[PDB]
Design a protein around this motif. Structure first.
Motif, mmCIF file in Angstrom:
data_model
loop_
_atom_site.group_PDB
_atom_site.id
_atom_site.type_symbol
_atom_site.label_atom_id
_atom_site.label_comp_id
_atom_site.label_asym_id
_atom_site.label_seq_id
_atom_site.Cartn_x
_atom_site.Cartn_y
_atom_site.Cartn_z
ATOM 1 N N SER A 95 21.729 54.306 -28.333
ATOM 2 C CA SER A 95 23.048 54.163 -27.840
ATOM 3 C C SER A 95 23.862 55.060 -28.580
ATOM 4 O O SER A 95 25.239 55.253 -28.591
ATOM 5 C CB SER A 95 22.934 52.708 -26.691
ATOM 6 N N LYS A 96 23.678 54.020 -30.144
ATOM 7 C CA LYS A 96 24.776 54.551 -31.224
ATOM 8 C C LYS A 96 25.024 55.788 -31.771
ATOM 9 O O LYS A 96 26.233 56.806 -31.574
ATOM 10 C CB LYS A 96 24.667 53.055 -31.851
ATOM 11 N N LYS A 124 26.240 57.967 -28.010
ATOM 12 C CA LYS A 124 27.092 57.559 -27.919
ATOM 13 C C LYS A 124 27.330 57.424 -26.881
ATOM 14 O O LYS A 124 28.206 58.035 -25.775
ATOM 15 C CB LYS A 124 28.304 58.750 -27.736
ATOM 16 N N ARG A 125 26.739 57.079 -25.698
ATOM 17 C CA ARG A 125 25.863 56.315 -24.549
ATOM 18 C C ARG A 125 25.958 55.272 -24.034
ATOM 19 O O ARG A 125 25.211 54.627 -24.679
ATOM 20 C CB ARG A 125 24.721 57.387 -23.420
#
Length: 308
Positions: free
Chosen positions: A239-240, A243-244
């Motif tokens: 995720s990091k 960026k979602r």
């Protein structure tokens, strides 16, 4: 801002074994309007509504969705919005698409054109989840292409609602690293279904081959906990990097698992998802994985507290 939308989603519950069966009620649940008061009063922020649109649309162009079914979906969505719940709708159990994605590509895209046209002016608390659990011949690479085509259709009609995008290979963590969400799309949430250890959560499940050999499996040791944290750390790192935001759109353990282990697994998973600021939806409200008894009108207090 999809991260704000993820916060709006917050903690939810799936009303399954309902509109994703061939006919509503065939699998045991009919979505009663009062269920929205029950769920909102218990503290949930949203409901996820699996919908098998593919059996309620013609097979020949332009693949029109049938009127009575569209009206039923509208009734369910508006029922939930009336209580201030956010709502996730999807395309669920479209098996023909999984088995021959080339043949069913245009029909799938026509369903999204019609669903986006129907709901484009509905509130911002309605979310569009492209396809439940792509698998089989809809491989990870074919899903990356198909999901981008679905994003183009939806965005051609609606640039307001957040879209939810799952992973291939049945929607878990296996294929997360293969998932690609196009850089041009900026208002989507990535969803994962977390059922690990699968042998624990699906023990004894009648539709699962060889699940009877898992019956009795327990969950709750420190090593069980560490293993689950490692998998959550993998999702969080993805995720990091990408960026979602993350939505764990289904998680739960089947009623054949012992209740203490079910409470411990459900409570631990929720505490760990919340430490990572993920949204989540329990599988499911009132049937085989259920936490609410519709006859007695009572929640399993320990599982509700696990969810909060």
């Amino acid at each position: 801002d999809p991260f704000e939308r993820n916060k709006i989603l917050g903690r939810g519950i799936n009303i399954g074994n309902a509109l994703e069966a061939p006919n509503e009620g065939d699998w045991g649940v009919v979505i009663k309007d009062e269920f929205f008061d029950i769920i909102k009063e218990a503290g949930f922020s949203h409901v996820r509504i699996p919908i098998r649109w593919s059996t309620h649309a013609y097979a020949f162009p332009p693949y029109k969705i049938m009127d009575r079914f569209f009206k039923r979906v509208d009734e369910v969505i508006n029922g939930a919005l009336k209580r201030g719940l956010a709502v996730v709708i999807n395309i669920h159990h479209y098996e023909e698409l999984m088995n021959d994605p080339e043949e069913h590509k245009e029909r799938f895209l026509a369903l999204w054109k019609q669903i986006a046209d129907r709901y484009k002016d509905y509130p911002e608390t309605l979310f569009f989840e492209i396809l439940n659990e792509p698998h089989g011949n809809l491989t990870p690479e074919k899903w990356n292409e198909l999901l981008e085509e679905a994003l183009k259709v939806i965005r051609s009609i609606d640039k307001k609602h957040t879209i939810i995008i799952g992973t291939a290979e049945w929607g878990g963590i296996s294929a997360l690293e293969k998932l690609s969400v196009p850089k041009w799309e900026k208002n989507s949430i990535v969803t994962i279904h977390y059922y690990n250890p699968f042998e624990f959560t699906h023990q004894g499940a009648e539709w699962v081959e060889g699940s009877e050999k898992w019956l009795g499996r327990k969950w709750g040791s420190p090593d069980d906990q560490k293993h689950l944290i490692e998998e959550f750390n993998f999702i969080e790192e993805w995720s990091k990097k990408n960026k979602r935001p993350i939505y764990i759109g289904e998680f739960g353990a089947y009623r054949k698992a012992d209740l203490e282990s079910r409470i411990k697994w459900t409570s631990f998973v929720v505490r760990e998802m919340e430490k990572r600021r993920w949204s989540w939806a329990y599988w499911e409200f009132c049937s085989g994985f259920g936490v609410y008894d519709t006859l007695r009108k009572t929640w399993n207090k320990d599982l509700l507290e696990a969810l909060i």
